[PDB]
Amino acid sequence: KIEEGKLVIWINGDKGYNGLAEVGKKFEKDTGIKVTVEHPDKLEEKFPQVAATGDGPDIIFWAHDRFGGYAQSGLLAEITPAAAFQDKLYPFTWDAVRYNGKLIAYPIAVEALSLIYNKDLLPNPPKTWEEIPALDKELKAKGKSALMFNLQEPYFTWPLIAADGGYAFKYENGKYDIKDVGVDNAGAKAGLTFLVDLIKNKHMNADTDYSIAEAAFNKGETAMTINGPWAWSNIDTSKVNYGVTVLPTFKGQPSKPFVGVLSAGINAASPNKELAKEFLENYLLTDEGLEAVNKDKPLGAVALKSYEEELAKDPRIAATMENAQKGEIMPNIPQMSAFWYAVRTAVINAASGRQTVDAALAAAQTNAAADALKITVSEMIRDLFGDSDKSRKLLESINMA
Ligand SMILES: OC[C@H]1O[C@H](O[C@H]2[C@H](O)[C@@H](O)[C@@H](O)O[C@@H]2CO)[C@H](O)[C@@H](O)[C@@H]1O
Numbered sequence: 001k002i003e004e005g006k007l008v009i010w011i012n013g014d015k016g017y018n019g020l021a022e023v024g025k026k027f028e029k030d031t032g033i034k035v036t037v038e039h040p041d042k043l044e045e046k047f048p049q050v051a052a053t054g055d056g057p058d059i060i061f062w063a064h065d066r067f068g069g070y071a072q073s074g075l076l077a078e079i080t081p082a083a084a085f086q087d088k089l090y091p092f093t094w095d096a097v098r099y100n101g102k103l104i105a106y107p108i109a110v111e112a113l114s115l116i117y118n119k120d121l122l123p124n125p126p127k128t129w130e131e132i133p134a135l136d137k138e139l140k141a142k143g144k145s146a147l148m149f150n151l152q153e154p155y156f157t158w159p160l161i162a163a164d165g166g167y168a169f170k171y172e173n174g175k176y177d178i179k180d181v182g183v184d185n186a187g188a189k190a191g192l193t194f195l196v197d198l199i200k201n202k203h204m205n206a207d208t209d210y211s212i213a214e215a216a217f218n219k220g221e222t223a224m225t226i227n228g229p230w231a232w233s234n235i236d237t238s239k240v241n242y243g244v245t246v247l248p249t250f251k252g253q254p255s256k257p258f259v260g261v262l263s264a265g266i267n268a269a270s271p272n273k274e275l276a277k278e279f280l281e282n283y284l285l286t287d288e289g290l291e292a293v294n295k296d297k298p299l300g301a302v303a304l305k306s307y308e309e310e311l312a313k314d315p316r317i318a319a320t321m322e323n324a325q326k327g328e329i330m331p332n333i334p335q336m337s338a339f340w341y342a343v344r345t346a347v348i349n350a351a352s353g354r355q356t357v358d359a360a361l362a363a364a365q366t367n368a369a370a371d372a373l374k375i376t377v378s379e380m381i382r383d384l385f386g387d388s389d390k391s392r393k394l395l396e397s398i399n400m401a
Pocket residue numbers: 012014044063064065066111153154155156228260340
């Protein structure tokens with residue numbers, strides 16, 4: 001199903017995929033082995049669908065939060081870096097791609113959202129979310145807006161929902177409690193309410209997506225946006241005079257973005273596991289490898305110590321790491337995809353006025369908790385009854401669409 005003797009790589013469309021394809025060319029030049037980089041739509045859903053039938057790319061790139069799930073489903077090969085190779089990347093990046101004791105991906109870079117602002121429209125960007133309504137009125141009088149960011153992906157609204165107490169799964173004593181979901185508590189509700197009120201009072205539009213936000217910021221129509229490192233080179237080319245800074249506070253609490261570690265996994269179905277490791281260890285995770293990708297779209301703070309040090313003085317990366325330190329590294333547990341699906345629905349339904357904030361988050365809490373538990377009890381049934389028809393029939397009924 002997967003062709004032997006070449007490498008197929010999937011990476012998200014906002015990432016430096018042409019830069020990655022140049023690393024693939026260097027590899028073709030040395031080894032004679034061809035490398036095709038693709039950025040399919042809805043990658044993180046596509047990968048488990050094809051990989052489950054034994055198909056898909058040799059290498060999958062995504063933030064580490066989806067990897068525990070892919071690993072629980074048997075879609076990923078355990079990786080085999082030697083100790084010398086492991087020494088080249090920071091310890092906390094290895095930790096993010098460790099699942100049940102096993103390394104399940106190669107860490108590439110640490111990403112967090114920051115506030116991005118146009119210095120010509122707004123020399124002094126707001127410290128607090130609460131100042132945005134008055135700032136938007138001032139800017140509307142000049143034919144501009146205060147803030148636009150992607151409202152269709154809950155990743156972008158999460159920092160605000162988390163500011164006053166929203167959380168995915170409660171983390172204590174080194175473990176996530178999968179029954180303790182923080183999606184409908186008073187702090188989550190307050191943050192989503194603030195966002196919905198911005199929409200109701202006409203300071204933002206519920207339909208705003210990634211491309212709408214990026215164009216408007218890059219063409220100077222809005223004074224602020226919320227985005228990651230991968231967005232910066234488009235802003236460089238647009239010549240807007242921008243700064244990257246700390247997210248505004250909400251109720252005097254820091255915004256708490258969920259932090260991702262962009263990682264590369266090897267497909268368990270892949271007949272090229274050795275070729276894949278040669279590429280990632282010896283071509284991509286080198287100074288020259290990461291530079292080709294970073295020069296395409298910035299990676300953030302990369303996992304490779306040698307090249308991290310080279311980019312450490314960039315104020316935009318310092319701001320990134322200042323926001324990351326206020327937030328938290330996402331869990332990689334298999335229950336994360338349940339969390340994200342439930343919160344996506346809540347934000348879109350609350351924003352568009354289809355449900356109240358209270359109803360939207362009540363149902364997201366219920367759905368997230370129920371789906372997490374279905375993941376949990378599935379693994380338990382397999383431990384009890386093995387890989388068997390009995391356990392297959394229990395699981396089909398338990399996870400019934
Ligand atoms: O919106 C939920 C979504 O958040 C994160 O996805 C990010 C990704 O980590 C970033 O690299 C960037 O590309 O934007 C994505 C959001 O559009 C989680 O990694 C992802 O699993 C989750 O569904």
